[PDB]
Design a protein around this ligand. Sequence first.
Ligand SMILES: Cc1c(CC(CO)CO)n(C)c(=O)[nH]c1=O
Ligand SMILES: Cc1c(CC(CO)CO)n(C)c(=O)[nH]c1=O
Lengths: 313, 309
Amino acid sequence: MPTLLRVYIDGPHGMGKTTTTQLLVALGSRDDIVYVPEPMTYWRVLGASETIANIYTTQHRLDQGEISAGDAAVVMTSAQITMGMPYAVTDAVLAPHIGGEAPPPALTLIFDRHPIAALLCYPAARYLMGSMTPQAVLAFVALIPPTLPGTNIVLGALPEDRHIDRLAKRPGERLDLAMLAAIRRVYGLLANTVRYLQCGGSWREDWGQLSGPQSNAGPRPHIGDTLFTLFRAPELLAPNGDLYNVFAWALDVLAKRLRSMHVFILDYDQSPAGCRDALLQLTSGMVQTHVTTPGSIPTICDLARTFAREMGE
Amino acid sequence: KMPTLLRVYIDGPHGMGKTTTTQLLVALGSRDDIVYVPEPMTYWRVLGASETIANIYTTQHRLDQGEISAGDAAVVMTSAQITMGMPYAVTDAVLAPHIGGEAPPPALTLIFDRHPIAALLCYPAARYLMGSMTPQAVLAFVALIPPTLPGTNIVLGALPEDRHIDRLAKRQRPGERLDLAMLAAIRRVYGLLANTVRYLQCGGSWREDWGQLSGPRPHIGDTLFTLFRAPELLAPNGDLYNVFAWALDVLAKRLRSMHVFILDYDQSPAGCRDALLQLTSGMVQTHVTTPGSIPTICDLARTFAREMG
Ligand SMILES: Cc1c(CC(CO)CO)n(C)c(=O)[nH]c1=O
Ligand SMILES: Cc1c(CC(CO)CO)n(C)c(=O)[nH]c1=O
């Protein structure tokens, strides 16, 4: 059976993910590598109208006190459902084609973001910004689809100053430095969480250490430097100080989903061609998988091209 | 070989039963070979958010009165459904790893108050029919329906509409408002769901029959697929956008492997309880994945009941 290499480029927006991905894709033949782009058309028109603008405007109004936290939360929750829909459906239809982890792959699929971006990372950042409740975040977490074998996720590293500059120049988006800090923090925590879990970390065991980044490498992070630290919110705690079991189970799910992922860190603090080559080098250590059928490869290509054509900018 | 497990999801339109019928189910779970996972009302009223049900019905009411727009309503309904389904989704996520392949007497029987599709498909679809939810949101929820594991036995209630109104009227939940339009919508959705499973099990291909919605198994017009001929999901030329077609492919995948059983609620609580037991003979059992799965599932089920009532 031919092999497949799936690579999800994720991390805070504004670092150069899209450019780097396009450049990498431009290196290979036409049908040896395919790009599943940002589904902007879905967010702007198909799933809803100007979702990105609606999100930034809602956050803005909240920060201005023009709307309540509850009003912002319902809007953000609904908006994130729209945001993640394309990722979710793609994963659901791709799942049957993915076999065990496996040598040139017959096909490389590069994704612009993974489902956890819309089901975990941004919701978590909105939570830190006061525009989403922690319960809604955990509901999203409980909905994260089972992690498929060979889930290679590439996160990005970039100095905040450089990130801010790059963002202060380059939809309906607004320049929110607080959101940038929050999303940068969430993705940093995410990387540590994966490393924490792969180093044998048990959140239930270390929860008490919770009172007052890189993966595939380094020592085991302290739980306080992982995503688990975000869910110590009073809303999730029972009178006795412990997490309600329903939320604790959502954390068990978070652990299960993240522990099997293969996370890599890409340094975006360089030229476009530089990032491309760095990413190319990174793919050398990524995990490939066998496909379930002989026709899976062509089917996957069609799926990717169909997705790109319909929801890509 | 690992012990066997029998999972039963009691679903269908709410308000068909009686308090005594439920207590019998609680009684059923008294023995350690059977556990009854009740509705997570505490999660809906307090843990996940404040009075979620009240919020849902007030929102629809305000939409009907024209106090709010369809858009405002949809945002509220979508957010509320995420809260409503969270207990089911988290339960499925943690239980899933314990379910093995299809398989005497089950070592354990888990009777759940509802399946995740109730909150991820059925109520959302009903609200769509009530004009309070976009069809894109419904398909987004559908895209998140957990994979259907072996032994997914879902019991759907059957009851004449007038009798259903009678029972619903006498057992309204906190914040609920007696809405006959919503009753009709949810009853239709579940009727369509039952037909859909049969349509799929008999080899129906929604893509092949799609053209019939605009032109032995149920007619596609009598399945959930007819609800997605919604204009918002179609391109200028009338074709369904691929992203939504894929969501329908997911729906077909999830529903085909479900084992539906119809429970007639038009009888006494003892009758309904007996009818349920009668239905178990044809239900599919599965093996668990580990020797410790049974005890774990039991703890999970009991903890859920105790914490979320
Ligand atoms: C992915 C995502 C984003 C980021 C956006 C690019 O800046 C789309 O990639 N945002 C802002 C959100 O608010 N929610 C989201 O889910
Ligand atoms: C599961 C569910 C329900 C029904 C609930 C009773 O109100 C269980 O019997 N409802 C009403 C909703 O409005 N949304 C839902 O998701």
